[PDB]
Amino acid sequence: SLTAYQASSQARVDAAMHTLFTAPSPELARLYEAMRYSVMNGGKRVRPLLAYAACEALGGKPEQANGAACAVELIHAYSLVHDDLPAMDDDDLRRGQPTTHKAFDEACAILAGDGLQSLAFSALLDPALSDASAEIRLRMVTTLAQAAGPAGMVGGQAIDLGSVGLKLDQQALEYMHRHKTGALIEASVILGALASGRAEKGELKALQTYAQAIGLAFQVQDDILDVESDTATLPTYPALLGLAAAKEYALELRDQALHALRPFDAAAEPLRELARYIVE
């Protein structure tokens, strides 16, 4: 089941990340603690799940993707630490608990995020977290840097900033989302597939399509749930499309993701289950 697969994914990446967060000296203890706080918050580890699942879909042992899984989670975690800062989203809480700058301070949170990004690259190339060839590994870091950087995730965040008080159309909203969250979701599946040592051109293309579709499905579904909650109590896909059409679109995106996985056997079931889960 997806519940079982999420639990195994979470346990595996959490255990793998453990070693990364021991300070080499007492002087550095607080920094490493702030990084741990930013990561070890009981997160659902969807990005590790995607990396492990992509690896297994191609016949790899999941631990082959430990470096991939750690890297994408560390990039994700750093992005949230910075996003929560007063200069950005200005959030005092995340999932009910104080954000890193509140539990520590702003300077510490800035540095914790900066350190987490560097650690993500270290994890990708750590021989204990994988065994892929130098060349496969080359591809991995190239992909992560492109996905995480100013043409990917950071670019998405900058688009989000630059769109405050603009009336975006569907194309613009999707473009933003594809950067802000799609890029790192795609990196998760591509890195895990690469980690198997068995990935062919066609399969990577298929996984890219899958990843982009679930990336958008998450965003569309989030908007639908917001409207349904507001209806219950009182630029979005429902505003642009109408709620009925937005609902149809979320199902369409799920179906696009499932269709992209047609070249894979039963070993891809966790990826199929995740796509279904998004709209359940």
Numbered residues of the known binding site for Mg(2+): 83, 89, 91, 135, 223
52 binds, among Mg ion, a copy of itself, none (CB under 5 to 8 A by kind): none
Helices (H) and strands (E) in the chain, counts: 14, 2
What residue ranges bind a copy of itself (CB under 8 A)? 23-24, 27-28, 30-32, 35, 78, 82, 85, 87-88, 105-108, 110-111, 113-115, 117-119, 121-122, 125, 134-135, 137-138, 141-142, 144-146, 148-152, 154-155, 157-159, 161-162, 172, 175-176
160 lines the binding site for Mg ion (CB under 5 A): no
Let me know: does 40 contact 107? Beta carbons within 8 Å.
Answer: no
The count of C-alpha atoms lying within 13 angstroms of the C-alpha of 107, restricted to the half-sphere facing its C-beta, is 1
Q: Which is nearer to a copy of itself, 40 or 151 (CB)?
A: 151
Are 171 and 30 in contact by the 8 Å Cβ rule? The answer is: no
142 is written with which tokens? 């190239």
DSSP 25: S
Between 91 and 131, CB nearer to Mg ion: 91
Binding mask 83-122 for Mg ion (x = CB under 5 A): ------x-x-------------------------------
**120 vs 260 by CB, closer to a copy of itself:** 120
Closest C-alpha to 219, from 235, 232, 234: 235
Whole-number Å distance between alpha carbons of 70 and 39? 10
Is 223 near Mg ion (CB under 5 A)?
Answer: yes
Closer to a copy of itself by Cβ: residue 1 or 25: 25
Residue type, 111: L
